[PDB]
């Protein structure tokens with residue numbers, strides 16, 4: 723792929739997408755509804771299953 | 785170890801994500817009244833039988849002591 727030709731093709735094709743308001747950016751949405759980690763437990767029991775799948779995770783890094 | 789067929793979803797919360805003894809003060813009068821509502825009849829029939837038979841026996845013993853007097 724050539725960079726200049728892809729620039730020209732993208733400006734012709736994808737040039738009409740709307741811009742973004744500053745108040746509705748990705749960072750504002752991340753601040754408005756943040757992630758919360760809760761230490762908890764769930765199992766989904768089945769009466770006649772064969773396998774036993776399980777995952778244990780800790781709160782990791784962004 | 786005794787396979788049990790069952791279908792469920794179980795949820796559990798960490799013991800460091802909830803309180804320990806704060807609800808114990810709210811539920812204490814209700815639990816007191818519920819305990820006496822559940823065990824009221826048995827405790828009452830126990831008390832009636834024990835104290836009635838004891839009182840009748842002690843009364844008749846006192847009458848027996850009085851009958852020996854001159």
Ligand SMILES: CCCCCCCCCCCCCCCCCC(=O)OC[C@H](COP(=O)(O)O)OC(=O)CCCCCCCCCCCCCCCCC
Nearest residue numbers: 824825827828829831832833835836837839840842843846
């Ligand atoms: C002459 C010698 C004199 C001696 C004087 C002292 C005698 C002992 C002290 C007085 C005891 C009397 C009151 C006792 C109260 C205790 C608490 C209680 O009963 O609650 C439990 C109980 C509590 O239930 P709960 O709160 O549900 O656990 O109360 C009852 O259910 C009521 C019990 C009533 C039944 C006993 C009544 C007294 C019996 C006397 C019988 C006399 C017969 C006479 C026959 C001959 C006639 C010629």
